[PDB]
C-alpha cells in the first residue's frame, strides 16, 4: 500500500495496536472473574468482545506492515516470517537483558520481594523464549 | 505489597502488562504467517509462547489489583466485577467518542482513505461494545 512513514497515521496505528492488545488481555481476565462468580452469559460476551479486539489488533498490524512501518513493540520490520522471528528475538532480548532485571532490582529496593521474585521468574522465562526463537531463525535460514 | 500506589514498581507493573499484551498479539499474528507457509512446528511454538505471555500479563494484573492499583488502560479500579465492567465502559466510550473518530479524521486528511474507513469501522464497533458492556452493568445491578 501507500508508504505511511512519517505520518501521524503511523503513530495512531501504533497506539491503536497497543490499546487493542491491552483490551483483549483485560477482557479475558475480567471473563475469568465472571466465570468464577457464575455469570456465564457475561463471561461469554466478554470472550466474544475480546475476539473483536483481536480482529482490531491484527488489522492494525496489517496496515502497519502493508504501509512499510515497523513492529510497535520493537521498531523492527515484520514483512517476512524471518523478519517476524527477528522481531520476536529482539523484544525477548530487551525483556531479559534490561527490562525485567531492572524491574526486579527496583522492587527489591522498594521493599517488595514477592514482586521481585515474579519479575526474576519472568526474566528467566523471556531468556528461554529468546533462545527458542533463535533456534527457529537458524532453522529458517 | 497491598499498597503499591505511587511507587516505581506500580509503573513497572503497568509497563510490563502493556508489553506482555502486545507480545501475545504479535506472536499469534506471526503464527498465522508460519501457518500459511507450512511451518507447523514454528507456528506451534509461537502459539505456546503466546500462552506464556498470557500468564505473564495476567500475573501483572494480579499484582496490580492486589496492590490497590488501577487498570493500565483506563486508570479506573478493577477490584470487583462491577468495577471491571465500569472500566471496560469507560475505555470503550473514550475509543468511540474521541480516539477512533480523531484517528479517522487524521487519516482522511493525510490521504489514507482505506485506513480512515478502518478507523471509522472501529469507532462504530467500540460504540457497540460500550453498549454491550452497559447492558452487562445493568444486569449486574439487577
Ligand atoms: Cl450471566
Ligand atoms: Cl515447522
Ligand atoms: Fe477494538
Ligand atoms: Fe516475552
Ligand atoms: Fe512474557
Ligand atoms: Fe474496545
Ligand atoms: O478496542
Ligand atoms: O514477554
Author numbering:
A (entry chain B): 1 to 141
B (entry chain A): 1 to 142
Extract from the study:
In contrast to other members of the ruberythrin family, a crystal structure of native SulE shows that it forms homodimers through domain swapping, with each monomer contributing two α-helices to give two four-helix bundles that each harbour a solvent-accessible, single dimetal site. The exact function of SulE is unknown, but it is presumed to be involved in reactions against oxidative stress.
In order to test the effect of the total absorbed dose on SpReAD analysis, data collection at higher flux values was repeated on the same crystal used at 5% beamline flux, choosing distinct, non-overlapping positions at least 50 µm apart. Data sets at 13.5 keV and nine energies over the rising Fe K edge were collected at 10% and 100% flux. While there was no difference in the oxidation states of all iron ions between 5% and 10% flux, at 100% flux a clear difference was visible for Fe-2 and Fe-4 at position 2, where the edge position was coincident with Fe-1 and Fe-3, suggesting that iron ions at this position are reduced. Indeed, the total dose of 2.9 MGy taken up by the crystal at 100% beamline flux is close to doses that lead to photoreduction in other metalloproteins, such as insulin or heme-containing proteins. The study presented here shows that data-collection parameters that lead to a high total absorbed dose indeed result in a partial reduction of the metal in question, and that this is not only visible in the corresponding electron density but also in the SpReAD profiles.
